[PDB]
Scaffold this active site. Structure first.
Site, PDB file in Angstrom:
ATOM      1  N   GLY A  28     -29.036   1.040   7.213  1.00  0.00           N
ATOM      2  CA  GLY A  28     -30.307   0.918   6.497  1.00  0.00           C
ATOM      3  C   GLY A  28     -31.491   0.508   7.368  1.00  0.00           C
ATOM      4  N   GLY A  29     -31.222   0.036   8.583  1.00  0.00           N
ATOM      5  CA  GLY A  29     -32.302  -0.243   9.517  1.00  0.00           C
ATOM      6  C   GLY A  29     -32.768   1.054  10.151  1.00  0.00           C
ATOM      7  N   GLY A  71      -4.766 -13.267 -11.506  1.00  0.00           N
ATOM      8  CA  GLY A  71      -4.525 -11.852 -11.740  1.00  0.00           C
ATOM      9  C   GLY A  71      -4.996 -11.428 -13.123  1.00  0.00           C
ATOM     10  N   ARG A 122      -2.245 -26.137  -9.079  1.00  0.00           N
ATOM     11  CA  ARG A 122      -0.818 -26.143  -9.386  1.00  0.00           C
ATOM     12  C   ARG A 122      -0.200 -27.439  -8.854  1.00  0.00           C
ATOM     13  NH1 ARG A 122       0.084 -21.063  -8.488  1.00  0.00           N
ATOM     14  NH2 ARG A 122       1.255 -19.793  -9.996  1.00  0.00           N
ATOM     15  N   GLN A 156     -10.070 -17.367  -1.975  1.00  0.00           N
ATOM     16  CA  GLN A 156     -11.410 -17.328  -1.369  1.00  0.00           C
ATOM     17  C   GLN A 156     -12.563 -17.000  -2.322  1.00  0.00           C
ATOM     18  OE1 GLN A 156     -14.061 -15.357   2.252  1.00  0.00           O
ATOM     19  NE2 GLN A 156     -11.835 -15.483   2.536  1.00  0.00           N
ATOM     20  N   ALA A 157     -12.440 -15.918  -3.096  1.00  0.00           N
ATOM     21  CA  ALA A 157     -13.556 -15.416  -3.899  1.00  0.00           C
ATOM     22  C   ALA A 157     -14.065 -16.448  -4.896  1.00  0.00           C
ATOM     23  CB  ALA A 157     -13.158 -14.135  -4.627  1.00  0.00           C
ATOM     24  N   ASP A 202     -13.975 -10.884  -0.629  1.00  0.00           N
ATOM     25  CA  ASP A 202     -13.778 -12.184  -1.279  1.00  0.00           C
ATOM     26  C   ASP A 202     -15.060 -12.989  -1.428  1.00  0.00           C
ATOM     27  OD1 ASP A 202     -10.845 -11.543  -0.484  1.00  0.00           O
ATOM     28  N   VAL A 245      -5.550  -7.546  -6.013  1.00  0.00           N
ATOM     29  CA  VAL A 245      -6.277  -7.064  -4.840  1.00  0.00           C
ATOM     30  C   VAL A 245      -6.568  -8.211  -3.877  1.00  0.00           C
ATOM     31  CG1 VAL A 245      -8.452  -6.031  -4.052  1.00  0.00           C
ATOM     32  CG2 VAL A 245      -7.356  -5.175  -6.133  1.00  0.00           C
ATOM     33  N   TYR A 246      -6.344  -7.969  -2.585  1.00  0.00           N
ATOM     34  CA  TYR A 246      -6.712  -8.909  -1.521  1.00  0.00           C
ATOM     35  C   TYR A 246      -7.921  -8.377  -0.724  1.00  0.00           C
ATOM     36  CZ  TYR A 246      -3.685 -12.918  -0.933  1.00  0.00           C
ATOM     37  OH  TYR A 246      -3.049 -14.131  -1.061  1.00  0.00           O
ATOM     38  N   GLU A 247      -8.490  -9.236   0.124  1.00  0.00           N
ATOM     39  CA  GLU A 247      -9.712  -8.947   0.900  1.00  0.00           C
ATOM     40  C   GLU A 247      -9.833  -7.506   1.415  1.00  0.00           C
ATOM     41  OE1 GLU A 247     -13.103  -8.742   2.691  1.00  0.00           O
ATOM     42  OE2 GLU A 247     -12.586 -10.682   1.807  1.00  0.00           O
ATOM     43  N   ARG A 266      -2.838 -14.722 -21.147  1.00  0.00           N
ATOM     44  CA  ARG A 266      -1.427 -15.024 -21.399  1.00  0.00           C
ATOM     45  C   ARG A 266      -1.148 -16.526 -21.525  1.00  0.00           C
ATOM     46  NH1 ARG A 266      -0.945 -10.527 -17.922  1.00  0.00           N
ATOM     47  NH2 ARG A 266      -0.801 -11.914 -16.101  1.00  0.00           N
TER      48      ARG A 266
HETATM   49  S1  LIG Z   1     -10.431 -13.541  -2.427  1.00  0.00           S
HETATM   50  C1  LIG Z   1      -8.996 -12.512  -2.488  1.00  0.00           C
HETATM   51  C2  LIG Z   1      -8.142 -12.818  -3.721  1.00  0.00           C
HETATM   52  N1  LIG Z   1      -8.421 -11.891  -4.814  1.00  0.00           N
HETATM   53  C3  LIG Z   1      -8.873 -12.264  -6.013  1.00  0.00           C
HETATM   54  O1  LIG Z   1      -9.449 -13.340  -6.245  1.00  0.00           O
HETATM   55  C4  LIG Z   1      -8.662 -11.255  -7.121  1.00  0.00           C
HETATM   56  C5  LIG Z   1      -8.112 -11.913  -8.381  1.00  0.00           C
HETATM   57  N2  LIG Z   1      -6.876 -12.646  -8.148  1.00  0.00           N
HETATM   58  C6  LIG Z   1      -5.704 -12.019  -8.039  1.00  0.00           C
HETATM   59  O2  LIG Z   1      -5.608 -10.695  -8.114  1.00  0.00           O
HETATM   60  C7  LIG Z   1      -4.472 -12.859  -7.817  1.00  0.00           C
HETATM   61  O3  LIG Z   1      -4.696 -14.192  -8.302  1.00  0.00           O
HETATM   62  C8  LIG Z   1      -4.048 -12.902  -6.344  1.00  0.00           C
HETATM   63  C9  LIG Z   1      -5.143 -13.527  -5.487  1.00  0.00           C
HETATM   64  C10 LIG Z   1      -3.734 -11.508  -5.818  1.00  0.00           C
HETATM   65  C11 LIG Z   1      -2.772 -13.741  -6.220  1.00  0.00           C
HETATM   66  O4  LIG Z   1      -1.757 -13.210  -7.074  1.00  0.00           O
HETATM   67  P1  LIG Z   1      -0.544 -14.085  -7.684  1.00  0.00           P
HETATM   68  O5  LIG Z   1       0.706 -13.279  -7.438  1.00  0.00           O
HETATM   69  O6  LIG Z   1      -0.623 -15.496  -7.160  1.00  0.00           O
HETATM   70  O7  LIG Z   1      -0.791 -14.035  -9.283  1.00  0.00           O
HETATM   71  P2  LIG Z   1      -1.699 -15.060 -10.143  1.00  0.00           P
HETATM   72  O8  LIG Z   1      -2.835 -15.625  -9.326  1.00  0.00           O
HETATM   73  O9  LIG Z   1      -2.232 -14.379 -11.381  1.00  0.00           O
HETATM   74  O10 LIG Z   1      -0.696 -16.242 -10.605  1.00  0.00           O
HETATM   75  C12 LIG Z   1       0.601 -15.943 -11.131  1.00  0.00           C
HETATM   76  C13 LIG Z   1       0.893 -16.752 -12.395  1.00  0.00           C
HETATM   77  O11 LIG Z   1       0.823 -18.163 -12.146  1.00  0.00           O
HETATM   78  C14 LIG Z   1       0.085 -18.792 -13.200  1.00  0.00           C
HETATM   79  N3  LIG Z   1      -0.541 -20.076 -12.779  1.00  0.00           N
HETATM   80  C15 LIG Z   1      -1.487 -20.254 -11.847  1.00  0.00           C
HETATM   81  N4  LIG Z   1      -1.785 -21.573 -11.764  1.00  0.00           N
HETATM   82  C16 LIG Z   1      -1.014 -22.230 -12.655  1.00  0.00           C
HETATM   83  C17 LIG Z   1      -0.874 -23.571 -13.018  1.00  0.00           C
HETATM   84  N5  LIG Z   1      -1.605 -24.526 -12.437  1.00  0.00           N
HETATM   85  N6  LIG Z   1       0.021 -23.900 -13.984  1.00  0.00           N
HETATM   86  C18 LIG Z   1       0.766 -22.957 -14.583  1.00  0.00           C
HETATM   87  N7  LIG Z   1       0.648 -21.660 -14.249  1.00  0.00           N
HETATM   88  C19 LIG Z   1      -0.232 -21.274 -13.290  1.00  0.00           C
HETATM   89  C20 LIG Z   1      -0.926 -17.739 -13.621  1.00  0.00           C
HETATM   90  O12 LIG Z   1      -1.436 -17.967 -14.938  1.00  0.00           O
HETATM   91  C21 LIG Z   1      -0.094 -16.479 -13.523  1.00  0.00           C
HETATM   92  O13 LIG Z   1       0.606 -16.304 -14.749  1.00  0.00           O
HETATM   93  P3  LIG Z   1       1.311 -14.926 -15.208  1.00  0.00           P
HETATM   94  O14 LIG Z   1       1.028 -14.849 -16.685  1.00  0.00           O
HETATM   95  O15 LIG Z   1       2.800 -15.132 -15.080  1.00  0.00           O
HETATM   96  O16 LIG Z   1       0.739 -13.841 -14.331  1.00  0.00           O
END
Ligand SMILES: *SCCNC(=O)CCNC(=O)[C@H](O)C(C)(C)COP(=O)(O)OP(=O)(O)OC[C@H]1O[C@@H](n2cnc3c(N)ncnc32)[C@H](O)[C@@H]1OP(=O)(O)O
Ligand SMILES: CC(C)(COP(=O)(O)OP(=O)(O)OC[C@H]1O[C@@H](n2cnc3c(N)ncnc32)[C@H](O)[C@@H]1OP(=O)(O)O)[C@@H](O)C(=O)NCCC(=O)NCCS
Ligand code: NA
Lengths: 427, 427
Positions: A259-260, A97, A37, A16-17, A168, A137-139, A103
């Site tokens: 704030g109102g 994340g 992906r 979402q964010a 988000d 972190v999630y919403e 990485r």
């Molecule tokens: S709006 C509410 C969501 N919060 C946020 O936006 C806050 C920031 N985002 C996060 O904290 C995470 O992305 C959340 C939303 C919690 C989801 O967590 P995940 O468990 O899905 O972890 P990642 O998003 O970091 O993804 C895991 C690994 O997958 C790799 N990856 C993503 N996309 C691809 C593609 N297309 N191809 C290859 N790899 C891909 C990420 O790089 C990540 O890699 P690691 O190095 O193994 O973590």
């Protein structure tokens, strides 16, 4: 002609964010290329679907005005493609994340070498340097981290999450400010910058008014505009009194004014069987004579027990209760119209059904019908900022990998290597 | 260098929405000149003061990085000074009532004549063209008009306002996006634009997820993740079990996830006497095996009714009650660290007391101590976007008319003209 016409966005975002940020940039003219992906794409595609075999409204309402390419970024060919795309981009946006992009080999330092003009924009849960900087972190967790949960709801109930996307979408809009700020300075420097927004910080920014209250509480021991300031009004679950004698952190104030000016949520006709049959009604300090006329209490005009904020502190909830009796036979729209005659800040609790079908919001382009021949048309929220020079032209969300070959062609790849990349499962 | 260094803002704003926008512009380097009412100034100055005859925290926390000039804009000399200031401005910002600035003579058409490069930015309650365009709106009225109140709180309680400033500061942040967007296009066109943000629309933007749910509900008759869809969990006023049978508009879901990943607000040790002793715990579908290890019940790992969203939907609140029993003897930080080792989305409800004095937030410049040598130091929220190239330098809020003569001297007025304007009560 549109503010971000010509701005090329390499969009890594999901959920979402991040996508809210890049969608809104798309609405203002940006060329958004969404990297997804392989096979599954952005997880919102398959979340809360209303139709089997169709991208969810979660996806479509956050991914209009974008093109989709599938890419395995943990392959050598995928990383090479990213380098080419980065060199063509004005802005890179991601909400993976902590450390995920690093990485992959695309640290800020390396990105600067690839393209000295590109801006890197990131949404994370917590700020870099925070004790919790590595947390995912999630919403609702972000709402809890930023003070909103603690200060939302009632004194005799739990911390309460807001229906609004404080974690988000709010963080995405804040990141849009960061990105646009970095664009403005680039006209001077000719150089991109890294900008990051923590979800905790975006929440805390909107809860600034409660940091005001925390300091007031620390300094004076009381918050006079809160229901707990009224002697013997507020009680906990077990009937214990709640006064500021024993309160050291900003409490939940139910439907108090924030704030109102002071206010409350008042029932209108049909409240027993209609969850949204309410108005919000404000008692603004410069409007007491007007209110006295509306509720037929002329005797309250010149009484110091009633005619100042300070005088009303011991009885404001009594006053709200009495005003509420006047709305018992009127719907929320009748009440809003009545209060408007007096110039009193007051309006209805609009239901989501009412908002979805409201003519005014569609007239002004805030609720927009998106033309989607593949999935059927749907509603979305348009641009909340209106401009004299232009209007957004909102177009349907992409199918997964819909623009892969189109984008690869733009990078200069002939048909030979495109076959290879498909064959190698790179795209 | 800061992004908005050299950007001159003619700032008419008052209360919260407008001043949040212009303050944050100030934090990013903008030169903000705040125009204030003679004698009383911005109404926030006298609004819930913690010390007699000292500007309130409401004022100081929203008006750092600004200079203050007093001006009677209903006088011919005041209007003359405004024309001069407009010609030196990049952005004019206002949040007066509907038509107020027009009535002063400064319509958009006239402003364009004075300065073809200047951007006019407004906060309004409802958008131009809306049925309700002529209404005055405060914070919670906008929360109610934009769908947040209807969808926040519990199914057996009233519509509930957020503690977050969804109406005010949120609208201000949205306006900042609009202004920065207008600066972007001005680089192309050489011309300023008019930009406006309605408080209703800023709220609705954050409530996009509920407009998703409204369409899902209309299309399918159910929202499967909402508490109302769980067999005999939520009950109505007369005490009978809730269902989507008779629900046609998005209802309040208490502390449910609001998204694709279910969650709930769970009590921790001390909740009886500590209103914020809670964590939010999210049962992510992909994280289920990690949750089974913490819960210490591997029976559900291989059980089909349990390791799927569909398996849990009949008994989701049953397992939330059981997970809560694990936390009954641990504080919210002990419970959170227990879940951090599994990477589980779990986080504490942070109190305003904790946030105001948290080491991390001060380290990253998100909670900032302002050095105010006139009033004594206070805390504020800093810039929630962090940049690689610079840090904000936050400076204390101005006294009323502190920079009047300083600003007038910049307009090329001598001491004779200045004294005349003071005597005539124009400044
Ligand atoms: S709006 C509410 C969501 N919060 C946020 O936006 C806050 C920031 N985002 C996060 O904290 C995470 O992305 C959340 C939303 C919690 C989801 O967590 P995940 O468990 O899905 O972890 P990642 O998003 O970091 O993804 C895991 C690994 O997958 C790799 N990856 C993503 N996309 C691809 C593609 N297309 N191809 C290859 N790899 C891909 C990420 O790089 C990540 O890699 P690691 O190095 O193994 O973590
Ligand atoms: C907040 C709000 C409701 C306050 O209403 P208010 O106290 O009646 O103040 P107004 O803004 O309507 O201003 C009242 C009048 O004083 C005038 N005025 C304000 N400052 C002045 C000054 N320095 N010198 C001369 N006149 C001034 C205004 O032009 C207006 O004139 P009018 O009689 O032609 O209408 C109103 O400003 C508003 O609806 N703002 C837009 C939405 C918003 O931002 N709400 C606040 C969220 S934080
Ligand atoms: Na009357």
């Amino acid at each position: 002609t549109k503010p971000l016409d010509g701005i090329n966005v390499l969009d890594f975002t999901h959920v979402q964010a991040g996508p809210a940020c890049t969608q809104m940039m798309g609405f203002l003219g940006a060329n958004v290329i969404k990297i997804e992906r392989r096979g599954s794409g952005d997880m919102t595609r398959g979340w809360l679907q209303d139709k089997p075999n169709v991208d969810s409204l979660y996806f479509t309402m956050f991914n209009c005005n974008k093109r989709s390419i599938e890419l395995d970024m943990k392959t050598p060919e995928g990383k090479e493609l990213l380098e080419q795309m980065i060199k063509k981009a004005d802005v890179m946006v991601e909400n993976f994340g902590p450390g995920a992009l690093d990485r992959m080999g695309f640290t800020w330092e390396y990105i600067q070498e690839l393209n000295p003009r590109v801006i890197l924009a990131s949404v994370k849960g917590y700020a870099e340097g925070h004790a919790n900087e590595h947390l995912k972190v999630y919403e609702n967790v972000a709402q809890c981290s930023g003070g909103a949960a603690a200060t939302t709801g009632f004194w005799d109930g739990p911390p309460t999450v807001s229906g609004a996307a404080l974690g988000d979408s709010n963080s995405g809009m804040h990141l849009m400010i960061g990105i646009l700020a970095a664009l403005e300075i680039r006209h001077k420097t000719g150089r991109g910058q890294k900008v990051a927004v923590a979800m905790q910080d975006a929440v805390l920014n909107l809860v600034r008014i409660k940091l005001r209250d925390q300091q007031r509480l620390e300094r004076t021991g009381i918050l006079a505009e809160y229901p707990q300031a009224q002697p013997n009004f507020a009680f906990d679950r077990d009937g214990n009194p709640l006064s500021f004698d024993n309160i050291t952190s900003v409490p939940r104030g139910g439907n108090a004014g924030g704030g109102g000016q002071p206010g409350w949520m008042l029932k209108c006709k049909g409240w027993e069987t209609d969850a949204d049959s309410y108005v919000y009604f404000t008692i603004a300090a410069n409007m007491w004579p007007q209110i006295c006329d509306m509720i037929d209490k002329p005797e309250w005009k010149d009484d110091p027990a009633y005619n100042t904020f300070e005088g009303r502190v011991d009885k404001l909830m009594d006053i709200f209760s009495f005003i509420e009796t006047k709305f018992a036979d009127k719907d929320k729209f009748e009440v809003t119209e009545w209060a408007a005659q007096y110039g009193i800040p007051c309006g209805p609790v609009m239901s989501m059904k009412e908002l979805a079908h409201d003519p005014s919001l569609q007239k002004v382009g805030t609720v927009v019908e998106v033309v989607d021949e593949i999935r059927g048309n749907h509603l979305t929220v348009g641009a909340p900022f209106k401009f004299s020079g232009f209007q957004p032209e909102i177009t349907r969300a992409p199918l997964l990998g819909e623009h892969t070959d189109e984008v690869l062609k733009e990078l200069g790849l002939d048909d030979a290597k495109i076959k290879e990349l498909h064959a190698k499962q790179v795209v």
